[PDB]
Write a protein that binds this ligand. Structure first.
Ligand SMILES: [Co+2]
Length: 9
């Protein structure tokens, strides 16, 4: 989750 979101941001 965390890194999925960071990447997308
Ligand atoms: Co990150």
């Amino acid at each position: 989750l965390a890194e999925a979101l960071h990447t997308a941001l």
